[PDB]
């Protein structure tokens, strides 16, 4: 019987191997063991985004955020999800929030978040046209 962290790492390894439904199931089993861990939900939310399941991804972001209001990835995955759903204004504010939080937490993702922000703003602008 695997542990919650064992299942999370198995999920992680499947994700890296691009096996998104398999990984999402592993995170589910992690959650069964310990439902109070934000990273299990943010990890699965990223699976759902890769699986085109935005509503599920949205729901997992909300579960994570209720556990950890400071989660940079929960805000970033939420904004990415909203971006693909064409909720442009919400998407940008959540990407901006992820940026502020990471800066506050001295987390280094290089130019990733500003890069995603430009992409999101470019898309909203092009969409307006």
């Amino acid at each position: 019987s695997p542990s919650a962290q064992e299942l999370k790492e198995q999920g992680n390894r499947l994700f890296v191997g691009r096996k998104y439904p398999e990984a999402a199931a592993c995170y589910g089993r992690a959650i069964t063991r310990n439902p109070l861990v934000a990273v299990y939900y943010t990890n699965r939310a990223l699976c759902y985004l890769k699986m085109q399941q935005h509503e599920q991804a949205l729901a997992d972001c909300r579960r994570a955020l209720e556990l950890d209001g400071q989660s940079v990835k929960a805000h970033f995955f939420l904004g990415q999800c909203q971006l693909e759903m064409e909720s442009y204004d919400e998407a940008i504010a959540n990407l901006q929030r992820a940026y502020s939080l990471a800066k506050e937490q001295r987390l280094n993702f290089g130019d990733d978040i500003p890069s995603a922000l430009r992409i999101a703003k470019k898309k909203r602008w092009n969409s307006i046209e």
Partner: peptide, 7 residues
């Protein structure tokens, strides 16, 4: 150091 990655 990559944002779109699992933890």
């Amino acid at each position: 150091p990559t944002i779109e990655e699992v933890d």
